[PDB]
Amino acid sequence: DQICIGYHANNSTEQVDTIMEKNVTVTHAQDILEKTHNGKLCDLDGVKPLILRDCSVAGWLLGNPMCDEFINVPEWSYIVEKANPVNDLCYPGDFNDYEELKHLLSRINHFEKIQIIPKSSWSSHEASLGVSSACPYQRKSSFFRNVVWLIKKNSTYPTIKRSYNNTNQEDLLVLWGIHHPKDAAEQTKLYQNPTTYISVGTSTLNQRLVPRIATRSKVNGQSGRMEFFWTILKPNDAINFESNGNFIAPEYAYKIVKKGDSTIMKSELEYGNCNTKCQTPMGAINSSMPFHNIHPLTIGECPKYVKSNRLVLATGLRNSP
Amino acid sequence: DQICIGYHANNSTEQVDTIMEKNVTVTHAQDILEKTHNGKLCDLDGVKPLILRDCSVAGWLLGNPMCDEFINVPEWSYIVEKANPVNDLCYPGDFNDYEELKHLLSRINHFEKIQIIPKSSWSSHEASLGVSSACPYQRKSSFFRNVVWLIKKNSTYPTIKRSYNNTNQEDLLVLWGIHHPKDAAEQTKLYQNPTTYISVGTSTLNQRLVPRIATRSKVNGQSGRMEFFWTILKPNDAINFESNGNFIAPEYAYKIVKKGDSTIMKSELEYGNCNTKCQTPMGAINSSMPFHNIHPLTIGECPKYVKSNRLVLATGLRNSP
Amino acid sequence: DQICIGYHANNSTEQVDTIMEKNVTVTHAQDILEKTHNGKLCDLDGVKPLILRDCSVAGWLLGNPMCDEFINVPEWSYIVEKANPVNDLCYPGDFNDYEELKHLLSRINHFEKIQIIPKSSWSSHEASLGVSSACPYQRKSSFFRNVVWLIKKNSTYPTIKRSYNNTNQEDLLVLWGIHHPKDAAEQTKLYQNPTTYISVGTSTLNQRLVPRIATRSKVNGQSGRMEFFWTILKPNDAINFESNGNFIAPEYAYKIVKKGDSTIMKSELEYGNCNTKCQTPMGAINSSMPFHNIHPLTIGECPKYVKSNRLVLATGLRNSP
Amino acid sequence: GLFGAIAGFIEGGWQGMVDGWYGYHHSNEQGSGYAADKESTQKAIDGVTNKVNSIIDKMNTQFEAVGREFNNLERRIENLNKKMEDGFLDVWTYNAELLVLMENERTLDFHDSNVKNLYDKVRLQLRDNAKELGNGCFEFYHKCDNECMESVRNGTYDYS
Amino acid sequence: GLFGAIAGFIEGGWQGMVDGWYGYHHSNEQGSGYAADKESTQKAIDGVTNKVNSIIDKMNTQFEAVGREFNNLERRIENLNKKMEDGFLDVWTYNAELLVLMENERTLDFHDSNVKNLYDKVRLQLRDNAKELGNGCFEFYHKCDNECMESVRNGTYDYS
Amino acid sequence: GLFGAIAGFIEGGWQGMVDGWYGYHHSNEQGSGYAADKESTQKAIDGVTNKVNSIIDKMNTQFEAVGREFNNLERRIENLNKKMEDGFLDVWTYNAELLVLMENERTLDFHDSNVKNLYDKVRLQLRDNAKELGNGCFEFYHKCDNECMESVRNGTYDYS
Ligand SMILES: *[C@@H]1O[C@H](CO)[C@@H](O)[C@H](O)[C@H]1NC(C)=O
Ligand SMILES: *[C@@H]1O[C@H](CO)[C@@H](O)[C@H](O)[C@H]1NC(C)=O
Ligand SMILES: *[C@@H]1O[C@H](CO)[C@@H](O)[C@H](O)[C@H]1NC(C)=O
Ligand SMILES: *[C@@H]1O[C@H](CO)[C@@H](O)[C@H](O)[C@H]1NC(C)=O
Ligand SMILES: *[C@@H]1O[C@H](CO)[C@@H](O)[C@H](O)[C@H]1NC(C)=O
Ligand SMILES: *[C@@H]1O[C@H](CO)[C@@H](O)[C@H](O)[C@H]1NC(C)=O
Ligand SMILES: *[C@H]1O[C@H](CO)[C@@H](O)[C@H](O)[C@H]1NC(C)=O
Ligand SMILES: *[C@H]1O[C@H](CO)[C@@H](O)[C@H](O)[C@H]1NC(C)=O
Ligand SMILES: *[C@H]1O[C@H](CO)[C@@H](O)[C@H](O)[C@H]1NC(C)=O
Ligand SMILES: *[C@H]1O[C@H](CO)[C@@H](O)[C@H](O)[C@H]1NC(C)=O
Ligand SMILES: *[C@H]1O[C@H](CO)[C@@H](O)[C@H](O)[C@H]1NC(C)=O
Ligand SMILES: *[C@H]1O[C@H](CO)[C@@H](O)[C@H](O)[C@H]1NC(C)=O
């Protein structure tokens, strides 16, 4: 009679690596690295993200005529933007401290747009003439919808003196711009005054923009340039403007309504009519696993990322061929 | 007769963790993570730090009327500043490249303040009229004590042409400012000249500041703004000034006397009439141990920081219950 | 008769360290840390690097009279510059966004210099009078060779209106400058017009430089300053200039011919008439090994760097004394 | 490997024994059979479960790298932001690759030690009542029926 | 665990033996007593002291993170400066947690191996002059008085 | 150390045996000689070669830190760029120092285990045909000429 001690074998094909040896077959093994994703952009925690589609953050905020879809958006979970949005600054120019603003809007989850200077309150200037062929809407010359390109009235551009006082409880994102024309004739034609300025001030702001008249390469037909500026206006602070020309006045500002964790993501994906916990630019992750190699940059309840093909722990023992 | 081999046991309650098992009781164990600190700000190596208390670095350097305690400070070990110092720029405005300067003063351990332009040498302007209710001293209108707010004399502000040549062996921190008024009347009332400037130059500096006249929100009663600028002046270099108005002239500059390892620390703590080797914002560390979890940012002979509750090595062996 | 099991010994002196014990003698050991380098700057992959020697990147691009060696350089592998090149801006001044440009030229491996505005095409100004004693060539007053210091002709400086359109397939680095004079007399003496400007524009550029007249410390004899600016001009874009004075016009621009991996290295070494795979500031590495402690910053097929005296693996076993 | 039992003095594994990781094959007059050792198997299961969960749980959490925007004249700080994430995510790539290699080697040795200690459990149990055959088997000097065989597995044979 | 001695063929520890980590209990006509093995204890003390000091000393030094000031329009680079220190100090949090776990496991195994080698020291010393009882004790076939017992501990019994 | 063979029940190494890492010394009527065990030596060579290459290969690649230029008013971000590279290159300095220490300790134990398993290979081979002397030698109860001695080394003595 006989008793033998011994160990488990099976027909497992699973190999792992050690320091001393590689491709060792084992009875059981556990894979820790995730490699799968549904391949779509999905609501975070049951709330739809802000997918700008063909518009940029600038295009959206300024109100490019081609971004009407996002005239009054609801609360968002995270911001998705394409690699090179076609609808950015329809009128050529630049947006001052754009990246810092983009970074600010990552940590916001809802705006409310309010009127702060009615378009119809410009009793001494023309307010409905500032349209351009660079910014078409339905084959018709138009302009960024949230700011107003003021023009002289009766061969006179009186000095603008206006302000808005933030009587609300929330911070206020306020946007304005300055028009840099192509030559002196144009300056006279639009603003009368040859030597103009734009002064803007808050508790902390103190600027005086001077437009710049020059010939430059045409972009969407224009040698002129629009240059845009922003500030956060604090509860109970006021913003003051003064200009004798070239002023792209605000009409609408943004009341910061909901704040929270998010950021801007570069992705060419559409919405997936779907719902998730975790998200990469290439796709959303649904699993229990604790590591992945899909994409560096991420948002959501995301298991950790690393750059590797295969991570596999031995759990069982050396299997006998 | 009999001989047995065996091992130590005791009544140790100390548990540690391993990969395979956790809360294993052992006969001896060594704790490596430090968690204690005396809870006070203490002299580094027997030398008192620069504790600004309610003043900021700007307030101190410019000579805010409320920072008189720090009129002529001795050599310091490190700089402590509160989260939001109440005495900063008493007259509202901004300090140009403030953070870069703050960073410069971290690696300094002693200034010597020298007069470079006597206040009484301004024979063609008024030098003792530049006080403001924004900057009170003992219920009386005053101003930053190290710079001079010049004013017109006899309805005339002649063009200032001055300079200081650094005949010393040390580098020199030099501070000046420009006044941005609220309207044209004020400009005339203070400086006569409507169109003014401030040009400043060294071997490497080349600037021309232009003040900015505007209505803006009142801060400490003022719609005007003071904007301050600095430079390091090298041994044997000179600094040149020219202005026909709005010039906040220097009187005092700082001779960099002692350099060395330090930095600015945000802490609400007072001095502890005490002496130490290592320091965090929350407290000073005195021990032999090699790790801690108290606070990220630190200065002194400080054992290393990590974010963890408990680190404990087994030294003895498994204790038998 | 007898059979014994046993292990190898030799007369190896090689010691290694373990966790439990240190300086343990072993029969064999492998050193992994590299510590040697030929001590010279060598061609990368059989192609000579750009060794500026006593010139800086600014001096080279602007065409400082003392950098004639690098008038028309061939394709380079990497850029070497001394700690403090003696030939930088011979005429004192500054180079706008210098570090960003330096960083741009790291990832380039060949320029081709083209004429874009012939020096002899300035029919209404003087183009051959702009020389300075600050910039000597063979004891004779000269100037940066790639830009042109224009001067008034017949007590008149007409408004310059020029442009260049990038009809090439490659991007174009274009350089210009502005002269900041010492006083109004000089301004009249050189440019006639008291109030001058320089406007420059592309698809994306939009600037208007205004010179700054001031007394400042003399450097190489000059209280005046030259300030230089650059842009990349895209294929099919044009650059426009307009000025009524103080304009340091371009003549030559750089066609970006070869792009690729490289960067600027600070080293006091000369060329070694040699050829290598890997390079540090102190010397080039030739070996099979996988780690080193020579110098942090590197380029080439370089085994990894770490800060340690000795790394040695045991391969054999404990040797018996 | 390190402890000489698996693929050593025990030549191979038993395909037939499926109820556990380590165990017994018996042979007597009533027959021959496979049977797991519950305690030894469940010790190892616990250990290896906790080794796994320790690698997962103590990652709390690694670097959480959410993107930034730099522009055409901030190429230096973009490169800096680039290099930071290279360096980090390539530090974890080293950790994780090597951790898994080292712990894969220990886990196999853990199993080798377990089969060895099981062997020695029974050796000490049976004392002089059986001969070691050197291949992991003991041959009894007396009849060992199923009650006897199960008493070896319980740890209750010759309880004194 | 790995070497089968502590909490294995040696069931428990001796509370009574306080002068060292590993040692002897003897029993004869003159009495019974506990006594440490100096060499074995001091080997282990040295080792474990150097293991500790290696974890401490070779940290020379970790990241020394002294703070910076960024302003309202430098939120990107503030975030960058933020994330850097997250990533780093969370890399050391992984190292240190896991180092301690792995070395805690080795230290226990180190002790297990030590008690095993001590057992085998004496087994080889006594050869056929005593019987192994399998619980860590040897029963002598001859009288072993205190001089004899101390000679076992010295390594001097049957010196040949 | 951990496995008790090297510098334990085998007191010392053989200077005379140069053809391999582990092996045999025989002694009989025809003479005495040293001879390596090929298999055991080549197992270890493979292992240790792969341990080395694993430390080298899996570094693919560490941080590749190519320099940047910051100016007089960008001292904060220069310091930031500074501190990043401190922190990183000092993380690898910890990894590498400690990796080498831990694997140096395992490699010695690997060798100790190897000499032990070789000893037990032969013990099981010779069964009751020789006496263990406790110093790593077996004394045969019968004549063992060179053909016999080589048959022990082949693994072919008493092949059944
Ligand atoms: C415009 O200004 C002119 C001055 O020439 C004035 O006479 C005229 O009445 C104004 N026109 C309108 C339409 O109000
Ligand atoms: C440059 O020249 C081409 C003609 O060769 C023209 O089509 C293009 O529009 C020009 N670019 C600009 C910016 O004017
Ligand atoms: C001030 O200037 C006036 C010019 O109206 C001159 O006559 C007068 O004497 C000056 N006043 C003083 C106090 O010097
Ligand atoms: C804004 O309005 C409130 C009155 O509702 C006033 O008290 C406050 O001072 C105003 N803010 C400014 C900057 O003038
Ligand atoms: C320069 O301008 C003057 C005007 O005084 C003109 O008469 C003269 O002919 C011009 N000189 C030359 C050399 O062309
Ligand atoms: C400063 O003064 C010294 C004379 O003491 C002089 O040599 C030096 O050039 C002066 N510096 C400047 C910038 O003028
Ligand atoms: C493991 O490595 C082996 C031999 O080096 C190689 O043949 C194979 O590609 C690897 N395993 C698998 C499943 O590919
Ligand atoms: C260790 O973990 C145990 C069981 O998981 C738990 O009860 C306990 O909280 C831990 N030890 C201590 C002292 O808290
Ligand atoms: C190893 O350390 C020993 C003792 O701590 C010391 O004497 C020696 O300097 C080290 N080895 C060498 C070769 O220097
Ligand atoms: C194990 O087996 C014995 C003998 O066959 C049996 O009587 C008993 O039920 C079992 N005892 C335990 C403690 O499992
Ligand atoms: C150890 O004990 C022996 C026998 O009792 C005693 O004679 C001697 O003094 C000791 N020898 C050594 C080397 O410690
Ligand atoms: C090993 O040795 C035997 C006995 O001396 C010899 O006959 C044979 O050639 C060898 N066999 C093998 C398999 O190496």
Numbering used by the authors:
A (entry chain A), B (entry chain A), C (entry chain A): 1 to 321
D (entry chain B), E (entry chain B), F (entry chain B): 1 to 160
Q: What's written in the study?
A:
The crystal structure of an unbound form of the VN1194 Asn186Lys/Gly143Arg mutant was also determined, but the crystal was unsuitable for ligand soaking experiments. Nevertheless, this structure confirms that the Gly143Arg substitution is 15 Å away from the receptor binding site, and is thus unlikely to affect the binding mode of receptors directly. Its contribution to receptor binding is likely to be electrostatic. For the Asn186Lys/Gly143Arg double mutant, avian receptor binding decreases ~4-fold relative to wild-type in comparison with the ~80-fold decrease in binding by the mutant containing only the Asn186Lys substitution. By contrast the affinity for human receptor of the Asn186Lys/Gly143Arg mutant increases compared with either of the two single mutants; the combined effect gives rise to a ~104-fold gain in human receptor binding avidity compared to the VN1194 wild-type, indicating that both Asn186Lys and Gly143Arg substitutions have a role in improving human receptor binding. Two of the substitutions Gly143Arg and Gln196Arg are distant from bound receptor. They appear to increase avidity for receptor electrostatically by the introduction of positive charge. The double mutants – Ser227Asn/Gln196Arg and Asn186Lys/Gly143Arg identified in human isolates of H5 in Southeast Asia both have mutations (Ser227Asn or Asn186Lys) that compromise avian receptor binding. This characteristic may have been selected during human infections to circumvent virus trapping by mucins in the human respiratory tract that are densely decorated with avian receptors.
